[PDB]
Every structure is written in C-alpha cells, then in structure tokens.
Ligand SMILES: Nc1nc2c(ncn2[C@@H]2O[C@H](COP(=O)(O)OP(=O)(O)O)[C@@H](O)[C@H]2O)c(=O)[nH]1
C-alpha cells in the first residue's frame with residue numbers, strides 16, 4: 302500500500318504536527334509554497350506517501366488539522382510553511398475542550414467529529430492504496446486526548462482494514478498544565494490499547510530530562526521538546542518516505558513489531574541529540590542510540606527486555622560498520638533481548654540525512670520497560686481517584702466512575718502483560 | 726460504543742436540564758412561601774390595629790351612656 306493520511310488534533314498535536322511537516326518538507330525539497338526545489342530523485346520517489354500532488358508541481362501535505370479552539374490552528378496557518386496546507390483541511394470548533402477528556406470525547410468533540418470525518422473521506426477516496434492513518438496528539442489535554450481517540454474509533458469503524466498509527470505525547474508532572482492529566486491519559490491509553498496498531502510513546506518527561514540534563518538547557522520551552530519530537534518523527538518515518546532495501550509500510554512494521562495485539566507501544570530513540578560540526582562515528586551513534594539518556598520515553602530498557610527493535614541509519618557511512626556495531630550491541634547485551642523471538646533487531650540504512658546532521662540513527666523499541674510509563678500514570682490516577690478528586694469535571698459531562706474504573710484496570714492489565722513477557 | 730456515546734451526552738443534557746428545573750422549583754416555592762408569610766404578618770398587624778379600633782368605639786359608647 303502507499304498513501305498515508307495524517308491527522309493533527311489539539312494544541313500539542315498541531316504543534317508537533319506542524320513541526321513534522323516543516324522538517325520532512327525540508328527533507329523532501331518542498332518550499333513553504335509547495336514547489337519542489339531539491340537535487341536528488343530520492344526526494345520525490347516516495348513523496349506520494351505523505352504529499353498529494355496538485356496543479357503546477359504543487360505538493361500538498363495530506364494532512365487534516367483538528368482543534369476545538371481556533372488558536373493553535375491560526376498560529377499554524379500564520380507561521381512557517383503555514384500555507385502549504387489545503388485550506389479546506391482546517392477543521393475547528395470555537396468552544397474548546399478545557400483539558401477535559403469527557404468534553405473532547407463525548408460532548409464538544411462529538412459535534413466536530415463528523416466534519417473531520419468528512420475531510421478524512423475526501424482524502425482517503427483520492428488515494429490509490431491507502432495504508433492507513435497517522436495521528437499526532439497529547440494524551441493529557443482534552444481535544445487531542447478525547448477527541449483524537451474518538452476519531453480513532455470513528456475511522457476504524459469506517460476503515461477497519463487500514464492501519465491506525467499515533468505519536469501520542471504522555472504527560473508528566475515535570476511538564477504539566479493541569480492536574481487532571483493522569484485521568485485524561487488513563488482514559489485514552491484505554492482507547493489506544495484497543496484501537497491503534499502502533500503508538501509511539503513520546504513521554505514529555507524524557508524530552509524534559511534530555512533537554513535539561515543532556516542538552517543542558519536549564520529552562521526548556523515546548524519548542525525545545527518539540528525539536529526532539531520532530532527529529533524522532535522524521536527518523537521513524539524515514540523508511541516509509543524513502544526508497545531502499547526495506548521499502549516499509551505501516552502494516553509490515555506492525556507485523557514485525559507487534560508480537561501480541563495489545564503490546565503495541567513503542568519507545569523511540571535518536572542520536573545525535575541536537576538543540577554539530579563534527580559527525581560522529583557509527584560506534585558512537587549506535588551506543589548513544591541504545592542508551593537511556595537517548596530514549597524519548599522515561600523507561601530504562603535495562604529494566605525490561607526488548608521484544609522487537611528496528612534501527613534506521615541515515616547518512617553516508619559504512620554498512621559494514623553498521624552491521625558490526627548492531628550485532629555488537631546485541632551480542633554484548635544479549636540479556637536484554639528475548640530469546641523466544643529470534644532475530645528481532647532489524648536495521649535499515651538511508652543515504653539522505655536529516656537537516657543539519659551528516660549522520661544520524663533512529664531506533665524503535667517494543668520493550669517491556671514501557672510498563673514503567675504506564676505504571677507511573679496509574680499511580681497518579683489512583684491517588685486522585687481514591688479520593689474521587691476532580692471527577693466532577695467529568696461527571697458533569699455524563700460520565701460515570703465505572704468508566705474510569707475500567708480504564709484503570711485495563712492499563713494495570715497492560716502493565717501486567719508486559720511484565721509477564723519480561724519474565725520469559 | 727456509539728450507543729454509549731449517545732447515552733453519555735444524553736445523560737449530560739438530562740442532568741443540566743434537571744438542574745435548571747429543580748432550581749426553578751425551589752425558587753418558586755421559596756418566593757411563594759415568603760409572600761404568604763409576609764402577607765400573613767401584615768394582616769395580623771392590621772387586625773391588631775382593628776381590634777384597637779373596635780375597643781375605641783367600645784370606649785366611646787361606654788361613655789355616651791354614663
Ligand atoms: N511535547 C509537547 N507537549 C505538549 C505541547 N502542548 C501540550 N503538551 C502536553 O500536552 C498536554 C496538554 O494537552 P493540549 O495539547 O494542550 O490539549 P488539547 O488542545 O485539548 O488537546 C499536557 O500534557 C502538556 O504537557 C507541545 O507543544 N509539545
């Protein structure tokens with residue numbers, strides 16, 4: 302299959318999505334107006350995956366921008382590459398969602414969702430073979446969290462045979478906007494367990510830490526986090542946008558990364574962490590990439606076990622060095638890789654590097670350590686729920702404690718399952 | 726799931742409506758019981774004054790006999 306359909310929902314969603322479109326539009330030689338102006342053919346060979354070709358060369362990101370408040374989307378229309386987006390594809394309400402999962406999922410989002418699905422049909426029907434959808438959102442607010450998951454369900458109802466993929470930003474007290482974030486997160490984790498094939502877990506905690514204690518940025522802004530994010534998103538979408546050995550699809554990825562249906566929550570990592578005149582050595586990239594101080598989650602992989610791993614190496618380097626170093630990471634730390642999935646680390650190389658960098662390495666892990674993230678949230682949730690705090694904001698939207706109870710259970714279960722496989 | 730979603734938003738609409746309704750009732754009960762209470766008090770005051778009047782007529786009549 303070929304074409305992907307991209308969806309941005311909420312503030313955080315539209316911010317990281319706009320950055321992603323800037324970054325890969327640069328990689329593919331597309332100026333802010335939609336005109337190709339690059340050297341290589343490699344830049345246009347698979348451009349059909351993320352861009353719809355229109356009129357005089359113009360390329361338009363197959364993207365749908367969604368929000369319950371007009372702010373962030375105006376911000377987007379206004380800013381860099383602001384007018385590469387089809388103007389029809391801005392779908393927005395006025396009410397807002399008040400960092401409330403119930404509002405985005407049940408009340409306000411329900412109004413907006415049908416107009417979103419309308420734009421979704423228009424894009425999907427203009428595709429030769431739609432692989433599926435990619436959604437960007439946080440799980441801690443209201444629009445992205447609740448409306449996004451509602452969209453995930455709606456879309457699955459209408460395209461049950463396509464692939465659901467999300468970059469979902471997990472909330473962290475270090476970087477918080479509201480106390481209800483654990484609730485919102487636990488609710489959408491519930492949805493995601495059931496309705497996505499692959500969710501990249503972008504944990505704001507890790508982005509903070511890597512901004513603070515590695516990039517040594519004492520006061521990080523959401524832009525500082527989002528540059529880590531857009532770097533990761535370019536990284537993990539590379540082999541889907543560029544020709545090569547392992548021409549990748551969303552399904553094969555799923556098939557190759559998801560041993561068990563529910564355990565589809567991935568940990569991304571990137572080297573070199575930027576914020577670079579000296580390119581690193583393959584050995585460097587590799588070891589940096591597998592260290593925790595380069596994980597975008599928060600979990601330490603040395604605490605659990607890799608079920609599956611995919612590495613992408615971008616730039617001009619020796620494939621011999623790449624294979625040697627990859628096998629060196631495994632053979633050396635063969636304890637952290639399960640023995641019941643043989644040959645579970647795959648590697649790809651693409652010649653085109655990211656902007657600014659000459660050599661780079663991105664990494665995708667189905668590791669059992671993600672249980673830590675989920676556990677963290679579970680705790681925070683429980684604390685409050687145990688004393689039924691801040692629940693009125695949700696109950697007044699028609700919800701019942703039972704829903705929450707169920708969600709919690711599910712996440713708890715997820716953790717359990719993950720652990721089950723850590724001891725195998 | 727779609728039916729659940731319809732039920733939740735239905736619950737929200739019903740609960741707000743019940744709020745507005747119980748408010749309207751409570752307030753009407755209060756305003757009416759206040760009006761009954763205040764009127765009763767002024768009525769009894771004016772009636773005390775009327776018994777004062779009747780006793781004044783009684784006094785005048787008692788003297789126009791002496
Ligand atoms: N990394 C990152 N996280 C964000 C950004 N904006 C909000 N968040 C996180 O997302 C959550 C708030 O959700 P938000 O996207 O503002 O709400 P929405 O518009 O209702 O979906 C909190 O957990 C924030 O820490 C962003 O630009 N980048």
Ligand SMILES: [Mg+2]
Pocket residue numbers: 312442478
């Ligand atoms: Mg916000």
